[PDB]
Amino acid sequence: KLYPAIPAARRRPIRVLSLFDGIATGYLVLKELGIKVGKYVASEVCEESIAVGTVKHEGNIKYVNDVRNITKKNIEEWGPFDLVIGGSPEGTGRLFFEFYHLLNYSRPKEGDDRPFFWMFENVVAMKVGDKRDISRFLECNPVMIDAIKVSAAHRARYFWGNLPGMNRIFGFPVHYTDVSNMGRGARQKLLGRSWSVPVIRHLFAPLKDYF
Template sequence: MKVLSLFDGISCGQVALERAGIAVDQYFASEIDKTPIKVTQYHYPNTIQLGDISGHEAWDLPKIDLLIGGSPCQDLSRGRTINSSKGEGLEGDRSQLFWRYLEVLRTRKPTFFLLENVRMDKKHEEVISRELGVQPILINSNLVSYQNRERLYWTNIPGVSQPEDQQVNFQDFKDNDAEYLQRFKVKDTPSRLKMWGSGVSGSCKNVTAAEKINCITLKQDRWKNSGLVEFDGFCRYLSTRELELGQTLPVGYTQMLSFRQSEKVIGNAWTVDVIAHILKNLKEEVES
């Protein structure tokens, strides 16, 4: 299997392929951020890094069996204003990179493809579906993880369905080592006290006893119930270990990074077990 991964990030695709039992002969990755590349090359030193997708026409590649990627979602997210001065949607500065994915798909003509993105305004979803020629399946990561993370997956891999609900509870994964957790404590500054309230009655309480948390994000205090846990009289962020487990990554996968670096790359990552679930259908197709 020869795989081309666009916007590869920390190579969750390679972790998912392993879990799906799919052997990879060559894995080509397009990524420009040095931090996630550092993670990828630590775990998968044979990864062939191609650089910026804008230069894809010059890539010297063999026939690709599987094209995967999650094009940037910032301009498509429902949490953003559609009519902003920066040009939201598929023409936004970052989300317009979907068109580069499409160019690669049409140029390389892989046997199978998979594209992931956020839930978005229906008009943008319909454009992507029309261009790819398939309808997406909406999967919430909460079926295999303790986080609510709804994502759309467009693929020509046959037979893709919803994963079985694993009934994952955040409380079963929550760290309790007080010494370890000190590094994730949030300072109770006046502005934070005003914004969040006390640890018992404010935002921290929502995650402290929650079965599921809201989507793991680059900044855990961005949304209610997205990562502030009651701790030591106030709040703490989700630990690196908790973040990794929330995306069903192996514990220690981002150990070579600082906490803030890990928080960012994990927030941008895929939920591995969702991707592995989709790719299991590919394994059956290849072996049949």
Template sequence: MGSWEALSSCSKALSSPGTWNLETPDNSSPDPAGHLEEQKPLKAENNMDVVLVDSRELLCPTSPPPGRDRIAYEVTVNHRNIEELCLCCGSLQVYTQHPLFQGGMCAPCKDKFLETLFLYDDDGYQCSCSICCSGDTLFICESPDCTRCYCFECVDVLVGPGTSERIHAMNCWVCFLCLPFSQSGLLLRRRKWRHRLKAFYDLEAASPLEMYKTVPVWKREAVRVLTLFEDIQKELRSLGFLESGSGSERGRLKHLDDVTNVVRRDVEGWGPFDLVYGSTQPLGYSCNRCPGWYLFQFHRILQYARSHRGSQQPFFWMFVDNLLLTEADQATAARFLEMEPMTLQDIRGRVLQNAVHVWSNIPGVKSKHMALTAEEEQFLQAQGDARAKLVAKGLAPLVKKCFLPLREYFKYFSQNSLPLY
């Protein structure tokens, strides 16, 4: 884990020594086996602290308070089912249920949850609260390989007043999804929440592609990658998905510059693969092939590498266009890849440096979409030499960030350097 000081720029909360406080064990589940499958017990370590507060500690005012504070009032005073309240804002206009914790969600909060669920900061942690998908100051879970954060307001409203101060005083805090205990105050983790999260995304997201169920930490394996036309080994290693010293347990990458003579038997022999990446030729790269060739060859190899239909094994792909495909080629790509492209922009100091079109089934890529105006696209196309120098240094940081949600599915090596830059 990176130092707390390195996270200060992302408005994450610092912490200092504290003690264990374990309450409300999850022994009410009618399906112990199912619970064990979903939550692996943590080892008790001296530097790991937990806060779980009994719901009786919650503040119970005599009249309904405004905003989210009404959640405790409605549940403890009016005995309202928490599923009838929006866990994110306290609204009574519930549209659906929160996928991770017991409670409802109104329509606006549902949209925000879907948009921010797989967005990550440069430090490799999710950039918003896992409960309300908002929050200015966040606590980071210190459970190994967990990337989730929680805002001060959520823990004070749902766990109990003053909880944020108690967490702030701890040496190392474990979040509500990593604990072997399901309830703290009014915050009750759903059983098999990974299944619930996938079902929630499949039902509510405006995407034709189905999301894979996230994988528990202890089941994650190293990622197997096939890269076409552009080698991204350096970028994946900097993100922690590959490690020096090859071996199946360290992850592996197969790179191909020319796939003209590659057939299905070759790809199946090299595989299986978990991630397939391809792009149009890098800017400044001399080649006698048209940009459309890269698209068609990527689609062909992708069919060879895909998992069998109906497989629940996570399989991801990404194709990046360096603004070289024509409008007709982009329309063809949208038809072949069954989705519209996202436009990712590299903006530094409020100046647009570069942009790419991206097709991918990696969660969160769609949320990063920022369309270019016709003038901006013409400007970037005219800046071929300047953009080529940027691309020569490696993938733009905005493209690297797109791979961060894969930490929910594959093993990564936390000793590798973060942040991205």
């Protein structure tokens, strides 16, 4: 399935709904997309992401105190969302089902020509029954991308989403690897930051042609 690309003369800002994230990745990566944000709405049960947001992100983000607070009225009041992303820093099933329920509120109806994009993230240590159930719920197959091209750790990941070009395009770079090596905490940034910045900008690369 291929979606039509609007030309770049129509520069509308991107409305993002990021649901679960320890260190807020999506707004920062959208700041380094080169494009502006329409609406960025975040929420977290704990107060750690709220503290990180009220210290770092300068208050350009609409926060909700709890994920159990967002209803259909809040989605219809805070504008339609263009992107919906769910990740994480036995509650993983809880995170997925809250994600899918909020995803059903943000999906456009039959007739809207608005470009919609979503993404869900979890590693390959999931039970295979939960994997096939999530494949049934999302109507999309995950891709098993391993940390073996850029890394050596046995931490592979399944991806779900509506992203154009996500099957086998990811490979190993040498220049990005070289620039990312220079740290004494190189593999701690490999365990966290390499899952945060480069893979996400690699997957959300073609959105700048849309907007």
